[PDB]
Design a protein around this ligand. Structure first.
Ligand code: HEC
Ligand code: HEC
Ligand code: HEC
Ligand code: HEC
Ligand code: NA
Ligand code: NA
Lengths: 106, 101, 106, 106
């Protein structure tokens, strides 16, 4: 799907996690955030249409998602142990990874 | 060392990076920031296995990751790009300050 | 491609890096390993074919590749800066990631 | 602390995890390993005293601790979820990273 649709699925499910009641709701939100981030992996962003797939910048771009996928998995792991407090706070801490890619490429 | 001392090192060296002219200065400072962060990991700010303390420790884990990626750039001589990465660290410094400072 | 084929590629290109005499061999080999690790990420290994796609084991197994893809990219980045020796060394260090996965799921 | 000391901390605490019976022991042992690895990251080993701090050998030396820290972090993740057996098995798999650094630099 589109990068915007993935960025919407990321932004939406983050607020789902913030306002959730339990680990199942958190989990399925993280599972959807994960699938969306791995789907936006291939996208060329508007601000780098003048760079090739194997350029330094597109490696750095794709690496920003590698970081995000990893953190989602750490959070998701916390949800699967029934640690909802901690998972919710881990999800919160993604914000600076989201932010860091935007400060460079959004 | 003490928690104030780790924060000082982190703050001091973030400035050294801001005003640096070369990759060696920037490496040196990132390296010292990595050490202070891989140190401050195991302190308590004003239960150890509480949800708060995990998340306190987790903040330093995330910060260590970003310092290490900045080091990647500085080790590759990409000095400007390392300095921007270093500027973006503030988000994590701040986000933890908002919480538990 | 098949999981076995991804694994030959990984093993073959790892020995190419070991024996390389120039920067292009290491870079090219690291590029082919990155692609093969990415492709293999979604595969289901024989020993977990009767597990759910959302089992803890399939998350662990998927994560093992997340680790590997990360080290491959670290090494590739080093090679792209002319730190080819460091990249060859990094490639050798992959072996414990290869072994960690095999131990559990091969 | 001294490098030998950090190694002594790594070795003793690994043995503690192997023969543990609860999560608290495992978490605490891994925490001493992390701190030992952190502190050891900055050291210069006897065999690389005759090299530049920016040498491939020293870069690769530091990297071995980076890999090890990452594996300790994961083991710590399993231990926090009371997945004691799995954390003990992840701890065992650290020995590959130990051995790989020793074979080169010890
Ligand atoms: C790259 C490494 C990114 C990561 C990781 C995240 N985002 Fe993103 N985002 C990125 C780009 C390049 C863009 C621009 C999209 C475009 O087509 O111009 C975005 C955009 C967004 C948006 C706005 C989408 C829109 O329709 O205007 C949002 C709301 C957004 N991003 C949210 C978001 C969140 C919540 C993330 C992590 C939790 C995240 N992004 C990560 C690049 C990258
Ligand atoms: C937790 C996850 C933290 C991260 C990451 C960073 N900081 Fe920190 N910082 C933290 C706490 C709990 C406190 C309060 C400590 C106290 O006893 O007052 C601080 C404080 C500081 C300070 C002020 C220290 C003082 O003597 O008053 C500074 C200057 C500071 N922190 C800087 C800093 C920088 C530069 C960081 C990242 C680059 C950073 N901190 C991260 C907790 C955490
Ligand atoms: C999971 C997280 C894996 C990682 C990372 C690596 N390997 Fe792998 N490998 C894995 C599985 C499940 C299997 C069994 C495949 C099967 O269908 O039986 C393998 C197999 C191999 C093989 C042998 C293939 C065969 O003919 O039986 C080799 C040579 C191999 N793997 C090499 C290899 C290398 C070099 C890796 C990292 C550098 C590596 N593997 C990582 C699972 C995983
Ligand atoms: C480098 C990247 C290392 C990693 C990772 C590990 N070890 Fe280590 N170890 C390393 C060096 C260079 C040395 C030699 C130190 C010296 O002064 O000679 C060692 C030594 C040890 C020792 C011997 C202690 C002594 O008194 O000399 C032990 C017991 C030891 N190392 C244990 C150990 C363990 C358990 C690790 C993982 C579990 C490990 N090491 C990783 C370098 C590195
Ligand atoms: Na003071
Ligand atoms: Na089946």
């Amino acid at each position: 799907a589109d990068l915007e649709d993935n960025m919407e699925t990321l932004n939406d499910n983050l607020k789902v996690i913030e306002k959730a009641d339990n680990a199942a709701q958190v989990k399925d939100a993280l599972t959807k955030m994960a699938a969306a981030a791995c789907d936006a992996w291939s996208a060329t962003p508007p601000k780098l249409e003048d760079k090739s797939p194997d350029s330094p910048e597109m490696h750095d771009f794709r690496h920003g998602f590698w970081i995000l996928i990893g953190q989602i998995h750490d959070a998701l792991h916390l949800a699967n142990c029934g640690k909802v407090k901690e998972a919710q706070a881990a999800a919160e801490q993604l914000k600076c990874t989201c932010n860091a890619c935007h400060q460079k490429y959004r």
